[PDB]
Design a protein around this ligand. Structure first.
Ligand code: HEM
Ligand SMILES: [K+]
Length: 249
C-alpha cells in the first residue's frame, strides 16, 4: 500500500551518485554490517498504532545514539558524515536507508528496491522499542508485528541480516560472528543455526527462538535449503522495513 512521493530530478541524481559512492566507501571501510545495523535500528523503532519512530533520520541525534540498543552506532554515524556532506540535498533518513541497501548489495546480497523521499523528523522515538536479544518468539512478535507491523515471514528473513557481521562485548556484551564468512551475504546464518553451535560462532537467544517456534521453524529450514528463497523474502522484508511509516505506514 505505498504511494511514493515525487522528488526533483536533482534529488534523483544525488541518490544515484550517493549509491555509487556508498558502495566504494562501505567496501573499502569493511563496515557493511555496521551500516546495515544502523539502517535497521533507524527503521525498527516504528510503532504502527501511533505512527511514531521509523526511518526518519533521528538516529543521527546524540539522544537516540545514546539508547543502549544503539551502542556503537555513533561510529557508523561519524563514518558517514563526510560522505553525507557531499550530498546536502538528500535527507539523512534517505541516506541511512540507502547505506543499508548498499551494505546488503556490496556483500553479495539481493538488490533491495529503494525509493527516495523520506523526510528528516525532529523528534526521536522513545527508547526501548528495539528487540532484546535475551528474549524469544513472543517478544519478537510484539516488536516486529505489534509495533512495526511486519510479518512472521519478515521476522525470520530479517534475522538473516546476522549473516553479516558480529557482536562486540563492549557494545551489546555478546561477542563474535554468526558465520564463518561475516562480510558475505548468504544463507549461512540459517545453516549455522540449524547445525548446532560451533566453536567461535555466536547464537543469541533471539536467534535460537526461531528454531522452536512452529511458524518460524519451517522458514528457517526453507532459507537453509534455498538461498534464492531467502534472498527474495529478505529483499521483500528489508524493503518493508526501510519504508515503515513512509509513503503510507
Ligand atoms: C531479531 C531481533 C534482533 C536482535 C535481538 C538483534 C540483536 C543484535 C545484537 C545484540 C547485535 C550485536 C551488537 C554488537 O554487540 O555489536 C546485533 C548485531 C547485528 N545485527 Fe541484529 N538483532 C536483531 C535483528 C536484526 C535485523 C532485523 C538486522 C538487519 C536486517 C540485524 C542486523 C545486525 C547486524 C548487521 C549486526 C552486526 C553489526 C556489526 O557487525 O557491527 N539484526 N544484533
Ligand atoms: K555470511
Amino acid at each position: 500500500g505505498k504511494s511514493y512521493p515525487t522528488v526533483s530530478a536533482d534529488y534523483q541524481k544525488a541518490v544515484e551518485k550517493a549509491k555509487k559512492k556508498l558502495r566504494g566507501f562501505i567496501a573499502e571501510k569493511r563496515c557493511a554490517p555496521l551500516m546495515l545495523r544502523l539502517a535497521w535500528h533507524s527503521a525498527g523503532t516504528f510503532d504502527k498504532g501511533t505512527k511514531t519512530g521509523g526511518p526518519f533520520g533521528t538516529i543521527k541525534h546524540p539522544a537516540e545514539l545514546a539508547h543502549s540498543a544503539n551502542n556503537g552506532l555513533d561510529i557508523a554515524v561519524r563514518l558517514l558524515e563526510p560522505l553525507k556532506a557531499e550530498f546536502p540535498i538528500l535527507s539523512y533518513a534517505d541516506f541511512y536507508q540507502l547505506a543499508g541497501v548498499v551494505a546488503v548489495e556490496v556483500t553479495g546480497g539481493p538488490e533491495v528496491p529503494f525509493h527516495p523521499g523520506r523526510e528528516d523528523k525532529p523528534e526521536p522515538p522513545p527508547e526501548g522499542r528495539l528487540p532484546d536479544a535475551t528474549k524469544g518468539s513472543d517478544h519478537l512478535r510484539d516488536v516486529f508485528g505489534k509495533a512495526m507491523g511486519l510479518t512472521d515471514q519478515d521476522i525470520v528473513a530479517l534475522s538473516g541480516g546476522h549473516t553479516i557481521g558480529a557482536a562486540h562485548k563492549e557494545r551489546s556484551g555478546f561477542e563474535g560472528p554468526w558465520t564463518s564468512n561475516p562480510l558475505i551475504f548468504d544463507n549461512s546464518y540459517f545453516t549455522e543455526l540449524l547445525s548446532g553451535e560451533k566453536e567461535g560462532l555466536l547464537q543469541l537467544p533471539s536467534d535460537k527462538a526461531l528454531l522452536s517456534d512452529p511458524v518460524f521453524r519451517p522458514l528457517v529450514d526453507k532459507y537453509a535449503a534455498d538461498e534464492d528463497a531467502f534472498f527474495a523474502d529478505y529483499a521483500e522484508a528489508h524493503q518493508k522495513l526501510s519504508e515503515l511509516g513512509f509513503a503510507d505506514a
